[PDB]
Amino acid sequence: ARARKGALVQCDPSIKALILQIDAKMSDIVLEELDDTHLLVNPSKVEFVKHELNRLLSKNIYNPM
Amino acid sequence: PADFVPDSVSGMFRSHDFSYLRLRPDHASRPLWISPSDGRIILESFSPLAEQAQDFLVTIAEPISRPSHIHEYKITAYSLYAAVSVGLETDDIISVLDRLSKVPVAESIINFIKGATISYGKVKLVIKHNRYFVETTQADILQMLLNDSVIGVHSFEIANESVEVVKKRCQEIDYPVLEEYDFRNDHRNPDLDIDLKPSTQIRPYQEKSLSKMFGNGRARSGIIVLPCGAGKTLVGITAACTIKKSVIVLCTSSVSVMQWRQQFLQWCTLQPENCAVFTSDNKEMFQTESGLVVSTYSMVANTRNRSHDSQKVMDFLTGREWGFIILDEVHVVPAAMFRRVVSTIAAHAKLGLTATLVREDDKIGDLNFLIGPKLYEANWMELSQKGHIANVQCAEVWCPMTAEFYQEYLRETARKRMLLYIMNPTKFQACQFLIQYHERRGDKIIVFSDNVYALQEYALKMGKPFIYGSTPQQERMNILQNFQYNDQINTIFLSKVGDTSIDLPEATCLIQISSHYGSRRQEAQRLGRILRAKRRNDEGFNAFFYSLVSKDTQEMYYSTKRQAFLVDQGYAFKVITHLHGMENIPNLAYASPRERRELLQEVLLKNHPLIRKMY
Ligand SMILES: Nc1ncnc2c1ncn2[C@@H]1O[C@H](COP(=O)(O)OP(=O)(O)O)[C@@H](O)[C@H]1O
Numbered sequence: 001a002r003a004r005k006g007a008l009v010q011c012d013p014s015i016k017a018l019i020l021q022i023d024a025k026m027s028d029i030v031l032e033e034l035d036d037t038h039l040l041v042n043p044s045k046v047e048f049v050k051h052e053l054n055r056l057l058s059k060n061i062y063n064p065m
Numbered sequence: 066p067a068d069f070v071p072d073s074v075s076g077m078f079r080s081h082d083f084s085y086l087r088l089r090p091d092h093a094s095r096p097l098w099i100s101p102s103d104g105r106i107i108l109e110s111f112s113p114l115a116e117q118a119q120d121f122l123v124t125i126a127e128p129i130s131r132p133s134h135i136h137e138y139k140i141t142a143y144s145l146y147a148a149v150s151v152g153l154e155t156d157d158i159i160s161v162l163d164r165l166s167k168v169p170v171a172e173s174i175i176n177f178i179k180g181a182t183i184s185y186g187k188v189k190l191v192i193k194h195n196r197y198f199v200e201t202t203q204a205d206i207l208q209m210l211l212n213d214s215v216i217g218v219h220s221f222e223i224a225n226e227s228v229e230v231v232k233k234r235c236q237e238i239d240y241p242v243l244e245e246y247d248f249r250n251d252h253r254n255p256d257l258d259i260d261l262k263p264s265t266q267i268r269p270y271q272e273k274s275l276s277k278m279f280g281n282g283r284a285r286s287g288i289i290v291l292p293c294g295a296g297k298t299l300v301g302i303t304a305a306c307t308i309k310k311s312v313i314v315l316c317t318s319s320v321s322v323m324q325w326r327q328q329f330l331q332w333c334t335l336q337p338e339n340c341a342v343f344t345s346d347n348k349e350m351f352q353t354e355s356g357l358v359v360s361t362y363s364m365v366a367n368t369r370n371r372s373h374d375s376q377k378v379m380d381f382l383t384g385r386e387w388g389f390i391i392l393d394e395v396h397v398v399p400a401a402m403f404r405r406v407v408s409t410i411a412a413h414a415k416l417g418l419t420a421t422l423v424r425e426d427d428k429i430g431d432l433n434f435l436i437g438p439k440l441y442e443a444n445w446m447e448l449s450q451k452g453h454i455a456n457v458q459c460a461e462v463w464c465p466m467t468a469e470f471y472q473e474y475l476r477e478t479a480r481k482r483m484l485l486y487i488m489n490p491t492k493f494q495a496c497q498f499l500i501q502y503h504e505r506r507g508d509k510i511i512v513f514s515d516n517v518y519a520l521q522e523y524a525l526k527m528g529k530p531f532i533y534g535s536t537p538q539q540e541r542m543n544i545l546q547n548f549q550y551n552d553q554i555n556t557i558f559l560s561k562v563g564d565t566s567i568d569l570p571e572a573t574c575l576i577q578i579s580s581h582y583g584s585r586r587q588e589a590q591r592l593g594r595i596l597r598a599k600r601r602n603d604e605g606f607n608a609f610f611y612s613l614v615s616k617d618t619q620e621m622y623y624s625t626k627r628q629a630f631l632v633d634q635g636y637a638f639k640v641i642t643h644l645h646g647m648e649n650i651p652n653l654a655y656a657s658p659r660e661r662r663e664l665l666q667e668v669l670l671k672n673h674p675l676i677r678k679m680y
């Protein structure tokens with residue numbers, strides 16, 4: 001019964017891979033794995049990862065100009 | 066812009082605030098807005114004089130986008146060059162523009178029209194006995210053309226190969242050249258007596274297109290753009306029929322060669338004797354005084370290796386001075402060597418026929434001097450509501466990839482990444498469910514797939530015929546005929562081969578599992594196959610056009626980019642996140658995890674007579 005500070009991240013299977021892939025290069029991102037659609041991450045990294053995820057997801061979305 | 070107080074919100078508009086001008090009391094009637102700087106034109110389609118200016122504006126301004134209510138047009142130098150050709154002067158344009166513009170035509174716009182509207186009509190390029198003469202009606206031009214560093218009533222010769230250079234030089238220099246053919250007074254070239262049979266019917270939009278080409282009475286050289294299925298074949302036939310001279314047709318396909326000839330025989334009254342087809346099968350050339358040659362760009366663009374059978378045809382083509390050339394699917398003429406046919410083949414008039422006038426590279430604008438300016442463009446929506454072309458309910462289905470496949474997606478390299486998400490299990494379920502649902506409805510389904518390996522995988526499991534480059538003409542025709550006239554088969558799996566200039570009247574439904582990256586013309590041309598629907602006038606009929614795209618993949622980036630031309634035309638894409646009733650289907654591809662993993666490994670693993678008697 002230890003209060004491990006973290007953000008309860010709920011995500012779809014596709015997004016789950018991103019967090020795992022993001023954690024692959026940056027080990028400190030994900031503290032532990034909860035389930036397929038649930039994850040626990042460093043509270044500080046939440047701000048960074050969200051912006052980092054948007055940049056990666058921004059690429060697959062087209063921009064007119 | 067003199068003595069105008071900026072507004073508190075003027076900062077939001079970065080130098081685009083065009084409120085410095087004032088509005089006349091007659092703004093309620095004038096249907097045109099004009100941007101004083103960018104040259105953009107905003108047209109009201111729900112106001113009086115809309116039809117009055119719908120044709121005048123198109124002639125002068127090319128369309129950037131024509132959605133339902135507000136039409137958007139832009140004036141460009143190339144667009145003006147097309148307009149000035151058809152008996153238009155600056156005074157007429159200025160007078161009409163002021164009479165229709167809500168906002169006054171700014172001096173910048175006035176300056177733009179003056180410069181480009183005065184050069185036209187001082188240099189002409191004529192052809193005589195396969196010799197090209199740059200004839201000028203005034204002697205002053207000799208001091209400007211003969212002294213040009215590029216070149217080399219007065220008439221001087223110019224090299225045939227140099228035509229591609231001088232025409233660009235003409236655009237660069239003040240005077241651009243115009244190609245006008247006086248077929249009425251041309252007697253040296255033998256004539257071909259052909260007229261449309263009484264059964265023929267001329268539709269109004271085609272009639273407008275022909276008029277734009279025969280406005281002054283002399284055949285023009287340019288491009289005619291009409292939506293897929295509008296009847297461009299008849300437009301070419303009518304142009305050939307009215308000129309009544311030697312003609313030729315070039316198409317970038319083999320099956321389309323028969324289609325054009327088949328349409329030619331039925332619509333006009335040309336006898337089979339004067340028609341010769343120059344393809345890989347037969348190469349005989351008509352020996353009659355005049356006739357037609359329906360060939361392909363590949364046969365005429367080849368320069369290195371021509372055999373004896375084809376060499377004789379080439380001499381026959383080059384020796385004689387032809388009068389007309391028809392370029393079906395003219396959106397591939399400015400290529401590196403397809404453009405050589407225009408110069409090598411001698412003709413006094415050139416016609417371009419392409420449903421889509423766009424391409425990935427910036428060479429689209431080169432069509433101006435290869436074949437001429439743009440004569441007429443027909444709006445897709447206007448023809449659709451008139452019953453001339455079918456309506457399409459374009460849809461984009463989002464298929465999220467399964468976790469197991471997506472795990473390898475991140476690691477896999479881009480080259481193999483395409484193959485990875487093209488055969489995702491989710492797309493199989495969507496394609497199978499959609500095909501079955503439309504098959505039950507009684508729809509003729511065409512499935513397009515650029516990836517040959519994916520095409521084979523779909524067909525082998527689904528037990529449906531597939532067509533791809535390696536198939537012969539006989540086999541594909543047999544499959545095509547079965548798919549049309551037989552009730553047993555209602556779906557086919559086509560590839561990039563049938564992406565253009567193929568007539569499928571019975572096709573109503575289309576599915577695109579995966580296709581050619583960022584190419585836009587492919588999306589539009591493939592959509593044209595189901596715009597051919599024979600039953601496009603029955604009440605409540607709506608053709609179906611689907612584009613299955615994997616979520617969280619680069620296909621979304623490609624998909625949103627390739628359909629950027631249809632949105633400009635007016636078609637709107639609908640996002641389908643989930644298909645209702647898809648779970649209750651009895652069986653689906655790769656439903657169990659075991660089957661899914663089997664697919665994953667297979668796709669991942671993809672990358673002396675005496676001696677003769679002894680033996
Ligand atoms: N005026 C017309 N009368 C009869 N059929 C027409 C007419 N215009 C077009 N069609 C039909 O439209 C279909 C497509 O014609 P086609 O010339 O191949 O179109 P495009 O080359 O513009 O794609 C064919 O079935 C053709 O017979």
Ligand code: BEF
Nearest residue numbers: 293294420566593
């Ligand atoms: F533009 Be069509 F389909 F030849």
Ligand SMILES: [Mg+2]
Nearest residue numbers: 297298393566
């Ligand atoms: Mg055609």
